[PDB]
Design a binder for this molecule. Structure first.
Ligand SMILES: [Cl-]
Ligand SMILES: [Cl-]
Lengths: 326, 311
């Protein structure tokens, strides 16, 4: 069974899944300390409920919120929004790119114990258990990031929950992450190399898929095309069109790796970890929010000739296989 | 009146005050996410209550917990420990040395609003209002630290609450901070230049004191000698600056922001904890001939004048 912020669900209940999302991108404790940065907590909840309900109308049944402790994960927020939108949310453990000292001073053994607490016992005092481990790296894996990857591998092996990654500031990092994961004996079928739609290097994508990794083509709506005079948008969202990202889905299908593909928007309903009012910039690029995948990318791939049951396999079957602990 | 984690108190209730302390040195949300790092939340509470009760029995009536959001300040922990030990605790706003992105991406105007929120409205959803602003800087003030210092001055100017600082990685640095504070129009009498016992340059400290800054001699037991640091108190008294001295331990009862089990190292060096100032430093100064009344001025009068909001 798969643990969600409302409790455990069966594989049949997962449905159409977005595998790389967030309710809010923040920092530990920040939403509780300065909710007015988001207007108010109540406003953020309203926005996320409206957005998740729109995604639900368009067919979404589950999202994976990959927010870690250091990205400000507030599981009580996740649960409130999941319940009011009536959309399943899987919560994450792990470490993103902004660990505070209390995290980045820890050893691999200590990190392993922290992840196991959040998966096996619960997050904070809530009893809500994580269903995925998120890890993020920078171009060249730092010593501390290698400790995070090894601890993630150890926690996945103990619990069966999967690991999802991404690399910042580099269009490729999967080969370096995969080498660490395999040195710990982790099966590639437990790992999603996230944000792989940041590159057009098909050789790199196919070789990872061929080893059994999941390929997260999961920032599809992120494009600053038309926002050239806004340098902060270009840096965060890139200069490649959503179509260019989506066609990587077609390319991996066409090479026989339909079962290795996971798709998402990498959206959120508030963000404080970047420049002020960046939420408004993202919203102006993609008014559809989390509904971008079902409403625009799916029809786009159908128009290019991909059969509907292959798309159903990518959006339903693959994420259920990935999330189910094994 | 002075805001504490149990509400406002009058100056006369403040009493003997330790001006630079912590209950827990951590990171935002960490005690809530991994209480087992400290054994348990219950174990940290019991340790802190015992330690504060020991300090109270040695004469302490108030501590200033200078822990900021990014040092893991948990005002509900502070309120629980304050009530159990019957020691007043003043909580802090500001920014320490480990701001997360949601803080260090912010402008001076945004940081000002955040500090004002914590002073004027309350911390998180608790209604507990900060009574001091803490700012930490490193050797050569960074552009971000300068924004923090200016936001601190602006919040102080709007509320009357004082500012305490310190420079990590150097034995001086007060002049850098003073220049920024004065450029904002902040009175030196609202500012304590903390960790000033880390230098032996007596002429540097005397010059700051003559400009009206408070001098925080507040890491005395971290000589790991403490007597030499404590003689700086007598030296500043002899220069005529008794009214400008604040003394403390810079102690805590748990710490996760450094190496694992550093708390055990600290406890082995200073088993007196927060009672080190009243049990060791005060008798040392009296034995060196400082009158009782001068010691009461430093430990009672100066902190109340500093903490009392003064616009
Ligand atoms: Cl992320
Ligand atoms: Cl501090």
């Amino acid at each position: 069974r798969i643990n969600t912020v409302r409790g455990p669900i069966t594989i049949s209940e997962v449905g159409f899944t977005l595998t790389h999302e967030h309710i809010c991108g923040s920092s530990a404790g920040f939403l509780r300390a300065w909710p007015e940065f988001f207007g108010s907590r109540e406003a953020l909840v309203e926005k996320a409920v409206r957005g998740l309900r729109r995604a639900r109308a368009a067919g979404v049944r589950t999202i994976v919120d990959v927010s870690t402790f250091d990205l400000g994960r507030d599981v009580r927020l996740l649960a409130e929004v999941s319940r009011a939108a009536d959309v399943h949310i899987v919560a994450a453990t792990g470490v993103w790119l902004d660990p505070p000292l209390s995290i980045r001073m820890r050893s691999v053994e200590e990190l392993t114990q922290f992840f196991l607490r959040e998966i096996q016992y619960g997050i904070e005092d809530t009893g809500i258990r994580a269903g995925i481990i998120k890890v993020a790296i920078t171009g060249k894996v730092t010593p501390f990031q290698e400790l995070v990857l090894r601890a993630a591998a150890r926690a996945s092996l103990a619990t069966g929950v999967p690991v999802i990654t991404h690399t910042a500031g580099s269009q490729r990092g999967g080969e370096q992450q995969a080498a660490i994961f395999e040195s710990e004996g982790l099966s590639p079928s437990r790992v999603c190399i996230g944000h792989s739609d940041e590159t057009d290097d098909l050789s790199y994508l196919t070789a990872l898929a061929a080893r059994g990794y999941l390929i997260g083509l999961d920032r599809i709506p992120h494009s600053a095309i038309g926002l050239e005079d806004n340098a902060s948008a270009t840096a965060f969202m890139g200069s490649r069109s959503w179509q260019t990202r989506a066609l990587l889905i077609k390319a991996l299908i066409d090479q026989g790796y339909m079962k290795q593909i996971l798709v998402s928007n990498d959206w959120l309903f508030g963000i404080s970890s970047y420049v002020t009012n960046f939420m408004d910039v993202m919203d102006s690029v993609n008014p559809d929010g989390m509904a971008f995948i079902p409403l625009r990318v799916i029809p786009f791939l159908r128009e290019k000739g991909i059969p509907q049951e292959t798309l159903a396999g990518i959006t339903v079957t693959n994420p259920a296989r990935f999330l189910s602990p094994t």
